[PDB]
């Protein structure tokens with residue numbers, strides 16, 4: 096009954112930088128060929144949406160942010176074959192065109208048809224499917240999840256298990272997959288190993304879960320916030336050290352505990368200094384260090400190349416290294432299996448009209464994760 | 470007839486820093502348990518021996534440098550089982566104890582019983598087997614190859630094919646294995662791939678040979694010395710670019726030629742800037758960059774962590790990543806097979822008494838490789 100025409104719903108529009116979201120009434124055009132229209136059930140509030148707000152992550156304004164969510168398909172345009180109206184889904188911030196140099200590469204996952212490198216804030220056709228009173232509103236990463244309805248290209252959507260709690264699995268859209276995959280697919284943690292995770296936030300907790308799934312024998316969780324240590328242990332950290340309690344550099348305290356250094360270290364905070372530190376606390380001969388995120392406004396770090404000469408590996412990734420369309424479905428399946436748990440991460444569920452409030456919880460504080468329900 | 474007592478031979482002793490080598494008469498004590506005495510047939514002159522001279526690579530003086538050579542066993546001490554008097558060998562700058570955390574690791578190769586990290590300039594027992602007129606002379610990396618006779622621990626020696634041209638295979642002791650292995654074992658180049666090698670010197674030429682053995686489909690050789698380009702092509706480079714001819718940064722010219730960037734890049738010069746450049750000219754989503762060497766006096770490089778975030782890998786290694794004792798024997802076997810050639814690298818053969826002259830050829834110039842014969 097909306098199957099073939101415009102929709103009128105409320106979306107959180109960012110007109111200007113450093114301005115709160117504006118609950119507005121916008122019209123959502125019907126999906127063109129290979130586009131899919133989804134009715135949002137829940138969306139998480141991720142750090143990267145706040146960067147849009149600061150002007151740190153530069154993308155065309157006004158826009159409709161959000162990228163970590165789950166929904167239900169309302170209508171699909173011409174040529175769509177992967178989803179059907181009524182199907183559960185998760186929109187993908189990192190596409191899967193399935194045909195670029197990267198999609199075909201057995202390891203690569205940063206699909207070339209992504210809108211994060213040189214942001215356009217459009218659909219693959221270069222047009223916006225949103226208007227606010229005659230004014231065109233830009234998309235955010237082919238997602239725009241801070242809307243009751245959104246349109247996404249077919250390469251930016253994944254069909255998941257129909258019995259999926261969408262108020263929980265929305266995590267698989269960013270936060271969880273990003274940390275989880277960093278462990279299991281980027282570092283490729285091995286059983287019996289020792290790992291160090293710098294930052295015990297939500298992505299942080301997801302890395303620990305990965306390291307655990309992977310089979311690590313020890314997981315040192317490091318944060319300067321004692322308070323964050325309980326969940327970490329509950330989720331899998333075997334130990335937790337507060338760099339603030341030692342009279343010496345933790346790379347040292349860390350190299351001493353692991354007797355030589357850890358097998359894998361994770362810098363999940365995005366700090367430059369911490370990036371180097373984690374590189375160092377790693378076994379000099381065969382240690383692997385993974386950078387989970389770096390603020391979009393990061394500067395150059397200072398390092399001694401000698402750190403790599405001994406035998407260390409330094410890696411990075413977007414979306415936990417997962418081939419998005421192939422993998423999302425699988426993470427739900429594993430969750431449905433009772434494999435991993437997602438609850439420990441959800442610290443707040445607010446109705447969607449209270450967005451800006453969610454952002455406050457995020458901005459100055461302890462909010463592991465805030466889920467917005469529609 | 471020397472089988473169980475001191476020997477008197479000539480060695481190149483470095484008494485002081487920034488002083489030429491002194492052809493001297495020194496006595497070589499007989500091998501203790503698990504030590505082996507070797508009669509040198511030839512030794513290459515490697516860049517790292519000159520660092521000892523500048524004071525850049527800090528090791529106890531006076532010392533007997535050299536570490537890239539081949540010889541014949543004269544006597545073996547108690548408990549030796551791997552070599553027998555008369556056997557061809559290659560002394561190993563990077564040991565193989567076979568029992569440290571690193572020897573047991575399937576990838577690690579930087580044996581923990583190495584003398585490069587915290588140089589002692591002794592034997593595993595902490596004693597020197599050299600004296601010059603009553604004065605003790607230090608060892609260099611468990612090797613000291615600038616001597617007619619040397620003593621090495623059993624973990625620092627490899628037995629090779631008895632039909633081996635030792636005036637050619639001495640290369641497998643440093644120079645060749647270092648570049649070769651960087652390709653075939655550290656980057657683990659794959660067939661059909663595109664590679665970029667920064668620096669067309671000897672290790673440089675060995676990386677190109679590796680990339681070729683490995684099966685690359687394209688090999689861009691980069692150097693600011695047009696003159697070095699012929700051997701590179703002869704040895705395997707499909708193309709050669711001189712950064713000096715473009716009006717733009719080669720990371721760009723390079724990203725444009727490889728249409729996205731190379732699969733693997735090698736920084737074989739040891740320059741900080743070049744280190745970053747090679748990181749960048751690599752496919753953002755799945756490109757691997759390998760650092761073959763860094764001067765022992767290197768400073769911190771400046772970099773944007775964002776380079777790794779997309780999906781790139783940054784690695785380093787000592788001795789081409791090869792498990793020394795296991796591998797050396799195999800590189801001779803492959804050479805004996807007609808697999809790879811070593812000649813193109815040997816640009817100079819000088820009798821050993823003319824050491825300092827070899828160092829001149831090295832120091833200011835084009836000398837791919839200088840082999841010293843005893």
Ligand SMILES: [Zn+2]
Pocket residue numbers: 190191192193194195196197198206207208
């Ligand atoms: Zn693609």
Ligand SMILES: [Zn+2]
Pocket residue numbers: 141142143144162163269270
């Ligand atoms: Zn996110």
Ligand SMILES: [Zn+2]
Pocket residue numbers: 564565566567568569570571572580581582
């Ligand atoms: Zn060892």
Ligand SMILES: [Zn+2]
Pocket residue numbers: 515516517518536537643644
């Ligand atoms: Zn060398």
